[PDB]
Structures are given as structure tokens and as C-alpha cells.
Curated annotation (Swiss-Prot), chains A, B:
Regulation: Inhibited by pyridone-containing alpha-ketoamides compounds 13a and 13b. In turn, alpha-ketoamide 13b (tert-butyl (1-((S)-1-(((S)-4-(benzylamino)-3,4-dioxo-1-((S)-2-oxopyrrolidin-3-yl)butan-2-yl)amino)-3-cyclopropyl-1-oxopropan-2-yl)-2-oxo-1,2-dihydropyridin-3-yl)carbamate) inhibits SARS-CoV-2 replication in human lung cells. Inhibited ex vivo by michael acceptor inhibitor N3. Inhibited ex vivo by compound 11a and 11b.
Subunit structure: 3CL-PRO exists as monomer and homodimer. Only the homodimer shows catalytic activity. Interacts with host FBXO22; this interaction promotes the proteasomal degradation of nsp5.
Effect of residue 205 to V: In strain: Zeta/P.2
Membrane topology, Cytoplasmic segments: 1-305
Organism: Severe acute respiratory syndrome coronavirus 2 (2019-nCoV)
Effect upon mutating residue 142 to A: Does not affect ability to cleave and inactivate human TRMT1
Cross-link type Glycyl lysine isopeptide (Lys-Gly) (interchain with G-Cter in ubiquitin), residue numbers: 5, 90
Residues of the full protein shown: 3264 to 3568 of 7096
Protein name per UniProt: 3C-like proteinase nsp5
Described function: Cleaves the C-terminus of replicase polyprotein at 11 sites. Recognizes substrates containing the core sequence [ILMVF]-Q-|-[SGACN]. Cleaves and inactivates human TRMT1, preventing tRNA guanine(26)-dimethylation of tRNAs. May cleave human NLRP1 in lung epithelial cells, thereby activating the NLRP1 inflammasome pathway. May cleave human GSDMD, triggering alternative GSDME-mediated epithelial cell death upon activation of the NLRP1 inflammasome, which may enhance the release interleukins 1B, 6, 16 and 18. Also able to bind an ADP-ribose-1''-phosphate (ADRP).
Catalytically driven reaction(s): TSAVLQ-|-SGFRK-NH2 and SGVTFQ-|-GKFKK the two peptides corresponding to the two self-cleavage sites of the SARS 3C-like proteinase are the two most reactive peptide substrates. The enzyme exhibits a strong preference for substrates containing Gln at P1 position and Leu at P2 position
Effect of residue 90 to R: In strain: Beta/B.1.351
Subcellular compartments: Host cytoplasm; Host Golgi apparatus; Host nucleus
Length: 305, 305
């Protein structure tokens, strides 16, 4: 038993991380087949980030302006193309460690593992959630740009995030591997506002189910509630509205614990109105919303890849 | 910026995880060079775990009683030896993915990454701490035995933990890679008591420094305390006594934040006596003690391997 914030094994991604230097700046790139993906602001100087014309900048760059370095071997750039906010650098070598992969654009509330890299070298791996305002609360230092988020299903690496910038508030913003930003953010150094961050209600419920599975049951009660009356209370406390789709994915957890979803809702309602009163659930004093219902099912069953 | 419970890249360990089956039970093994390490209770049936005579049991087993399977290829067992509580199965093939490694016995309070595996297949990676009572609060399901903990320094994998059993209380116990148990535990299914679990004071202080680095400064105050008067308060709240050695390793963090260690101590003293009063530090409402002073320095500087 037990319950931990768990990340996917990162071995398959480690083999794809390369170092990209264009002119004076250096960040990480994702090397898949014979293409290197990286944030396009690699072609910027510090002065350019305020109001960059990425087209005009990229035009003055030539293929030999990009220094891709994989560990110690160096790749030859023979092509460069800009797809939205990512640069695609066609190289002369296919990565012999390219896993079965695909690019996916996740939805807010979903979780994924991040592999933090610096100079194309992996530093650490952690699990996070795409917030409802399309930011992430990660751990990034200068030169961590290029770091990617990912999920592993069986044997297929689904790349879903590439890190681009830190906002003045300390939160992080990036794109899918097609170069489209999550959220209304742009890649220039200007004051950018993220929306109100709400709590991922469906994930909290899944976490409460994990707690019941692991023996933490003090929060339960034999009241029930209505989906309607519960959402009224969720709104007041900045909680994402819960829908029938959210109830359905919770079905398997409800079946395993004998506790209907609406019963658990009535329990969560109490916790928001009355709080924890100094107690804990799964070692935490706050309500945790970075475990999806699938994450909980995975950890409590023993799924491998 | 930001701060996350971070684990080491697990790629180098993934390549060493094999499946071990002796008779009817199956668990994970660590394949390094031409040797497979696994918990020795693999040679037990469910009835044997109550009072096993591991010598007499192992004697009735022959080399071909052990089915080692790496992914899909199968290894040939040509030798078996028991070193304390781990089995060493000499095989006919050297792992071509053996990293630079070494076996280390860590001290209580140190952190390490765990790679949870099932059937020799990696499932997830998470960071934990060896508690002062020599247990760990992990995430293990039946068949997770054989899973190993590890640290990575530059290019050398230091293996420090192998998982053996779950205790009736839900905590976990295991050995070093030489087969010596952390703590007073044995590998039989009998009620075993772990000592009083105390809080890793030195780690809390390092975490408080991380918070100051990330902008959380509300807990600070310009009082100071004595090492003596502070330990009096630590004992009352089940906190590990702080020593001059603990102050020294905190030197680098003190230098980076301008806050002397004893000043931070006076801040922590207040938090224990008065609590958080509903606030948070680095997104947490509790005091976190699973970041060593080195972990904090690593994450806030950008060290790679």
C-alpha cells in the first residue's frame, strides 16, 4: 500500500534530449528521428525577447548557426523550419534511441511527467498537472527551456509539453510539440496574466478514493448530495464544476470502494465548509488535485510499461 | 524558479530491472554485470513466510529452479549464493546496460529515488527519505519486492535500497544491496514494530531555505536562538536533535540567503510552537522533511548527470 506523487520512468525520454545552441543562447531540444525540436526563442538575444520579430530573426540565421550536441557527439543541421513557436532542425542522423512516440495536446486538469534538463542533460523528473489556467507549477531554472512533459502508455511515449518561459509570477508556460501555446501566452518577455487558477475537483475526488483505499476514512459520512447543490459549494471555493463525465470516469473507483461518487461529493463538501481541522489525508493537510482518476487506478493496481 | 519533489532520471536503472521467478512466486531483480540480486524470500511459499529456514529452503532449490527473464529474453542461472537477505544469481550473460555503479548504505534522513517495478518492468519513480526509524513511506504493491532505491552522482549510480516487505502498519522495510536490513527488521511475516518516527530537522531547515529562495519569507523573524534552547523545543515536538554537523552542511544555503542557521532555527521554533495558522510554505501546509540540504542546493542551482 501507500501513495506517492509518482512520475513515469524517464529512460525513454533521456535518450532524446540534446543540447541546442544558436549564437550565444543554449537550451534543450527533443531529438526524434532526424529532427530536433526546441523553443524558437533560442534564436533571440536578451534584447530581442522584449519585442521579437521571429520571422526576420530566423531569416538572418543559417543552418550552420545552430550547434546541436547530443551528449558529446555533434549533429549536422541541414534544415531549419519554424512551426508556430517551436523550431524544427532537420539533422543528418536519425536518433537510434527514438522510442515509439506521438504528439498529443492534453486538456487542463491532466497530469504528465516532466524531465528537467540543462544543456541537453537530464537533471530530474517530477509529476505535475496542467492547471485550469493552462499554466504549470514546476521547477525550472534558466536553460531549462526545451524540457518536455510526457506520458507513457505501454510502450508509446506521448509528448505533450515543451517548456518555454517563466512568468513574472513564478508559474510556467509552454507549448505542445506542434508549437501551440497552452493558454493565451506568447513567447516574448512582457507582463502576461494567467487566469484565475481553480482546483481540479475531479482529481481531488480521485485522491479521496485513494485515501479510502489506503485506510484514511475519517472524512467519510453517510450523507449524500446533488450534483447541483455540490457545484454551488464548489464555485464559492474556486473549485472546477463537476460534470456527469467526471462522475463516469470515477465509476471504477466507486465500484472498488463501495462509495458512490455523490456520497464522496457530500464528504468533500463538508471538507470545504469545515476544513481539515488540523488532520491529514494521505500525509497531507491540504486537498490534493494533481492525481487524475487514472493515476489513482494505475498506482493502486500496478500498471507497467 | 519553483520547487518540486524531484526524482533522479531513472533511465540507467530501468536497463537493470529483471523478472525473477523461483517456483511459484515472482518479483523483481537487479541485473548488474552477470549477477541478479533479489530478495531471498523469493524461494518461499506463502506458508514459509511465517517461520522460514532460508538455509534449508535454499538447499532444496537448484539453479534451474530460478527463472530470470529480462524483458523477453531469458537468462541462464549457473550459480546461486545467499548474502545476508539477498540472493545472488550468477547468470551466463553480462548486462550490456550495466552503468557505472556502486553499493552504498545510506544513513537515516538521506533521500533517494525509488523505481517501482512489477514483473521486472518499471512502473514509476518517486523520491523518498529513509526515516529515522529506518523505514520508508513508499508506494509498493505485491510483487513490487526487488524494486531498488538509488542516487545518481554525475555518471555513477549508487544503489542503496532494495524493497523486501510491507509492515502491518503500512510502512516499508528493506536492505542495502549487500542484504543487510535497514532497521531491526527481519524477512518473515511476523508482527514487527518500528521505532518512534521523528522529524528530520536538518531537512526541514533546508526546505525553509528553499522557500526563502522562492519568495516565501513570511515565517522569518529577526530573533535568534541557541543551539541548546532550540533542541529543547525540538524534543518536545518529536524533532531530531540538531548538531554542529547539521549547521555546517547548511552553510552554503545560509551564505546564499544572508540568513544565519541559528536565525532560521529561531524561525522554525516559532512554527512548532505556533503552527502555520492556515498559511502555506512552498504550497504545503505541513513542515516538509524529505529534502536534504544537498537536494535543495541541487534543485536551486541546476546540477545534471
Amino acid at each position: 500500500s501507500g501513495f506517492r506523487k509518482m512520475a513515469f520512468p524517464s529512460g525513454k525520454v533521456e535518450g532524446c534530449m540534446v543540447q541546442v545552441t544558436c549564437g550565444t543562447t543554449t537550451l534543450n531540444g527533443l531529438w526524434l528521428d532526424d529532427v530536433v525540436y526546441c523553443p524558437r526563442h533560442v534564436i533571440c538575444t536578451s534584447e530581442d525577447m522584449l519585442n521579437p520579430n521571429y520571422e526576420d530573426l530566423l531569416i538572418r540565421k543559417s543552418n550552420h548557426n545552430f550547434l546541436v550536441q547530443a551528449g558529446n557527439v555533434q549533429l549536422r543541421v541541414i534544415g531549419h523550419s519554424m512551426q508556430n513557436c517551436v523550431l524544427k532542425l532537420k539533422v543528418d542522423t536519425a536518433n537510434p534511441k527514438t522510442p515509439k512516440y506521438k504528439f498529443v495536446r492534453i486538456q487542463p486538469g491532466q497530469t504528465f511527467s516532466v524531465l528537467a534538463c540543462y544543456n541537453g542533460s537530464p537533471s530530474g523528473v517530477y509529476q505535475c498537472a496542467m492547471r485550469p489556467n493552462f499554466t504549470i507549477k514546476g521547477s525550472f531554472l534558466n536553460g531549462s527551456c526545451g524540457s518536455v512533459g510526457f506520458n507513457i502508455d505501454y510502450d508509446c511515449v506521448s509528448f505533450c509539453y515543451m517548456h518555454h518561459m517563466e512568468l513574472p509570477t513564478g508559474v510556467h508556460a509552454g507549448t505542445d510539440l506542434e508549437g501551440n501555446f497552452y493558454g493565451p501566452f506568447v513567447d516574448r518577455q512582457t507582463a502576461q496574466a494567467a487566469g484565475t487558477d481553480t482546483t481540479i475537483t475531479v482529481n481531488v475526488l480521485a485522491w479521496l478514493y485513494a485515501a479510502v483505499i489506503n485506510g484514511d476514512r475519517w472524512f467519510l459520512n453517510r450523507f449524500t448530495t446533488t450534483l447541483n447543490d455540490f457545484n454551488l459549494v464548489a464555485m464559492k471555493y474556486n473549485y472546477e464544476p463537476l460534470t456527469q463525465d467526471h462522475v463516469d470516469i470515477l465509476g471504477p473507483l466507486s465500484a472498488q470502494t463501495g462509495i458512490a461518487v455523490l456520497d464522496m461529493c457530500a464528504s468533500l463538501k463538508e471538507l470545504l465548509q469545515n476544513g481539515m481541522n488540523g488532520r491529514t489525508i494521505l500525509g497531507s493537510a491540504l486537498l490534493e488535485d494533481e492525481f487524475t482518476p487514472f493515476d489513482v487506478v494505475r498506482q493502486c493496481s500496478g500498471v507497467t510499461f
